[PDB]
Amino acid sequence: TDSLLSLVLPDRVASAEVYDDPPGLSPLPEEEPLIARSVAKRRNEFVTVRYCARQALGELGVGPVPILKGDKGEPCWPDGVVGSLTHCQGFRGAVVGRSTDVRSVGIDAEPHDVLPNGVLDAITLPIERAELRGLPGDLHWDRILFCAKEATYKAWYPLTHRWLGFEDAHITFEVDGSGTAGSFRSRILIDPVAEHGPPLTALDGRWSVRDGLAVTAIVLLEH
Amino acid sequence: TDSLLSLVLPDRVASAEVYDDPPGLSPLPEEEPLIARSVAKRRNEFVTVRYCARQALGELGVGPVPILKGDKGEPCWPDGVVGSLTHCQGFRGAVVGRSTDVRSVGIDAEPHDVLPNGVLDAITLPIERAELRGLPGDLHWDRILFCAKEATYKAWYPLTHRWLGFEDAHITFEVDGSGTAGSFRSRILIDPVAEHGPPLTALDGRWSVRDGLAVTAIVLLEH
Numbered sequence: 001t002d003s004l005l006s007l008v009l010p011d012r013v014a015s016a017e018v019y020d021d022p023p024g025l026s027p028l029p030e031e032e033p034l035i036a037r038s039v040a041k042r043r044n045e046f047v048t049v050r051y052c053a054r055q056a057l058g059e060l061g062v063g064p065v066p067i068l069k070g071d072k073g074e075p076c077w078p079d080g081v082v083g084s085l086t087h088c089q090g091f092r093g094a095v096v097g098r099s100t101d102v103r104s105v106g107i108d109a110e111p112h113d114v115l116p117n118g119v120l121d122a123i124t125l126p127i128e129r130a131e132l133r134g135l136p137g138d139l140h141w142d143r144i145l146f147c148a149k150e151a152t153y154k155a156w157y158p159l160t161h162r163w164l165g166f167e168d169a170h171i172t173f174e175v176d177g178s179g180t181a182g183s184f185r186s187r188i189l190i191d192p193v194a195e196h197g198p199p200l201t202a203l204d205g206r207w208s209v210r211d212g213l214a215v216t217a218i219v220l221l222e223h
Numbered sequence: 224t225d226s227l228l229s230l231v232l233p234d235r236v237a238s239a240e241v242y243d244d245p246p247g248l249s250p251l252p253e254e255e256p257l258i259a260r261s262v263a264k265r266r267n268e269f270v271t272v273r274y275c276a277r278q279a280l281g282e283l284g285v286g287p288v289p290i291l292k293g294d295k296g297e298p299c300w301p302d303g304v305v306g307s308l309t310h311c312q313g314f315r316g317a318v319v320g321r322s323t324d325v326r327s328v329g330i331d332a333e334p335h336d337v338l339p340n341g342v343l344d345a346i347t348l349p350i351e352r353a354e355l356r357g358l359p360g361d362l363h364w365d366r367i368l369f370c371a372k373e374a375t376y377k378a379w380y381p382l383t384h385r386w387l388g389f390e391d392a393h394i395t396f397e398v399d400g401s402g403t404a405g406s407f408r409s410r411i412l413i414d415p416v417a418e419h420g421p422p423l424t425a426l427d428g429r430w431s432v433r434d435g436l437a438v439t440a441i442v443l444l445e446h
């Protein structure tokens with residue numbers, strides 16, 4: 001199934017997702033040092049999300065490869081591929097694309113639960129707090145905003161190798177007729193200069209709440 | 224030479240350091256994906272610091288192995304080893320120890336320069352700024368405190384897998400008779416629970432300013 005990510009992804013990318021840890025999955029041998037000292041719940045999400053990533057790579061025509069980690073934990077894709085990984089309670093998902101047409105991917109999944117006390121204040125600009133109070137529907141807008149901030153960081157970081165704080169992007173939401181999905185824009189408030197290619201002044205994505213999960217995706221195209 | 228790190232390291236660890244990038248050094252094949260998309264100055268520090276790490280491992284009786292990156296970029300050491308890496312303008316250094324007697328290592332090097340405008344206020348508790356004004360010597364105490372905070376994070380993170388912010392530790396310095404080296408204590412202000420072993424309520428290290436560099440080291444022993 002591509003049920004949940006199909007509601008946020010445009011064309012030019014492949015995806016895979018699961019909602020549990022299939023028993024007895026293994027990392028590739030090359031990946032073993034990344035999780036040798038990890039707690040079992042970290043091991044599980046690492047292994048299961050890379051099973052999803054190798055399925056998605058296969059839909060691109062790319063054979064199963066180790067997916068290692070680099071600067072600040074960013075995934076290391078095979079030559080000619082960009083992508084993003086996510087895992088939370090009840091979700092693992094991977095999205096990949098060819099770097100010939102896709103510049104960056106960021107995705108994130110969150111359980112559709114209220115944020116813990118104090119978290120909203122720590123992740124919002126004043127203006128975002130005002131905006132969220134005006135958004136329609138029985139949704140955890142705090143959590144959806146959090147999910148979109150996380151996807152924004154994952155799409156930004158591989159293009160800049162610079163920190164992007166919660167106060168460094170203003171996220172604004174649009175809501176479709178369903179009331180359970182729509183678009184967002186992340187307007188960058190700091191130096192937008194990329195390592196390669198045009199400045200990152202804004203990143204556009206989609207959000208969707210379904211099956212107890214918020215998902216967000218940003219797919220920035222190569223021009 | 225072990226010149227600069229010899230002024231901050233206790234027993235039970237091996238180290239290696241250089242002040243430039245020896246030309247023609249290569250990553251090991253397994254490390255290539257971590258720097259395949261990096262800018263040249265990031266490749267250089269990554270490659271040279273792992274040359275230092277493999278020398279230091281050799282001093283421990285450990286053969287040359289890839290040093291990959293895991294959660295939040297932490298280095299991935301061979302079974303039975305802990306350690307820390309640092310690189311800045313004019314310095315690469317690696318410190319390793321056996322996990323049977325060493326629990327964690329965090330090291331950091333900084334150019335001995337004033338911090339850029341605004342950085343001191345972003346990295347200090349109000350009380351720290353007042354204490355730094357009290358410390359003696361023609362030293363960049365702002366930079367030395369920054370260097371010690373970075374070492375604190377590197378020692379902390381592999382034991383907790385939790386964020387530690389600048390405001391989450393109070394560092395206090397003592398100054399030796401030389402006026403150019405001494406001890407510091409990092410008092411943890413958040414939940415100190417470790418994943419394994421006793422709580423991290425405080426981390427003790429040494430600092431040394433020499434040859435235009437600040438170096439810090441924390442070596443937490445296994446009991």
Ligand SMILES: CC(C)(COP(=O)(O)OP(=O)(O)OC[C@H]1O[C@@H](n2cnc3c(N)ncnc32)[C@H](O)[C@@H]1OP(=O)(O)O)[C@@H](O)C(=O)NCCC(=O)NCCS
Pocket residue numbers: 045046049069071072073074075084085086087088108109149150151152153154155157158164165166167168169
């Ligand atoms: C990196 C971060 C965003 C991940 O958020 P999260 O909700 O825990 O995300 P998930 O657990 O669903 O996904 C983590 C995956 O993201 C990817 N990722 C991690 N660091 C990354 C980075 N620097 N760049 C790109 N992708 C990264 C990894 O593939 C990771 O999974 P893996 O370790 O199994 O390979 C978060 O830990 C973080 O550091 N936040 C601070 C920065 C931020 O949010 N800024 C706000 C910007 S507006």
Ligand SMILES: CC(C)(COP(=O)(O)OP(=O)(O)OC[C@H]1O[C@@H](n2cnc3c(N)ncnc32)[C@H](O)[C@@H]1OP(=O)(O)O)[C@@H](O)C(=O)NCCC(=O)NCCS
Pocket residue numbers: 268269272292294295296297298307308309310311331332372373374375376377378380381387388389390391392
């Ligand atoms: C990780 C951090 C401390 C590195 O500081 P820095 O001055 O850039 O350090 P250096 O470049 O000298 O050393 C980087 C090395 O530290 C190691 N390191 C990176 N992340 C690490 C982590 N989570 N845990 C342990 N070591 C880590 C790596 O080996 C890295 O080198 P490599 O990428 O070539 O392998 C910094 O980037 C950071 O994230 N700071 C915010 C957290 C913090 O400082 N809190 C204050 C605590 S009181």
Ligand SMILES: [Mg+2]
Pocket residue numbers: 001002014015016056059
């Ligand atoms: Mg699919």
Ligand SMILES: [Mg+2]
Pocket residue numbers: 087
């Ligand atoms: Mg996570």
Ligand SMILES: [Mg+2]
Pocket residue numbers: 086087088108109110147150
């Ligand atoms: Mg998430």
Ligand SMILES: [Mg+2]
Pocket residue numbers: 224225237238239279282
């Ligand atoms: Mg030595």
Ligand SMILES: [Mg+2]
Pocket residue numbers: 310
């Ligand atoms: Mg650095």
Ligand SMILES: [Mg+2]
Pocket residue numbers: 309310311331332333370373
């Ligand atoms: Mg440093």
